[PDB]
Amino acid sequence: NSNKLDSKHSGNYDYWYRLFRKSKLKPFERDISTEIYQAGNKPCKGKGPNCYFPLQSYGFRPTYGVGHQPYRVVVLSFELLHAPATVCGPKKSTNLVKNKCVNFNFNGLTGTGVLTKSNKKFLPFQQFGRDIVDTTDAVRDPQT
Amino acid sequence: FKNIDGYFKIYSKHTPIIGRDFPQGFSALEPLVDLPIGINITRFQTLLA
């Protein structure tokens, strides 16, 4: 609910909404237009009887009922399909704890064992570590 | 450059060269960026100064 930023003394008629459209609205379609709705068979372009403006106001005052308050509505649309991920959740990090058996989930690789300091010569682009037989051996700390 | 499953990848490496132009000495080549382009790359063109 937004009764503080969409309301004030002496009233406010800033917002608008449409009740008279030639047809229904396709999902995710914007219909920004000021076209007078036709009534009967007149080509009337104006305001008055049988000649209605397409959009009306959402006049807001700090004193209404609950069903008339200026609710702030935000809808989040997502695409959960087979496509490269670009926006996603806050992956959480923890401490390290060296020289101790521990389950590790470094940046998506999961395994078990003991981790400690090393003297690799890791190239800056390098992220993983392996051996002759393709087994994850050394992991660079993503936060250190 | 390549566009395997999208994910445009660019690998760059700068060598001061020798008196020749295209040398024969080996020069490893390191990645620089990889971003999810996901478009049908078919044609290629360069820009001049």
Binding site: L123, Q126, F128 | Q24, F26, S27, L29
Partner: peptide, 24 residues
């Protein structure tokens, strides 16, 4: 303008396929 001369690439243009460190 430009030319279309052809030259031999020799041994050239090998990049790191992955980011996994190796040695020896």
């Amino acid at each position: 303008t430009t030319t279309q001369s052809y030259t031999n690439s020799f041994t050239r243009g090998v990049y790191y396929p992955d980011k996994v460190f190796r040695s020896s």
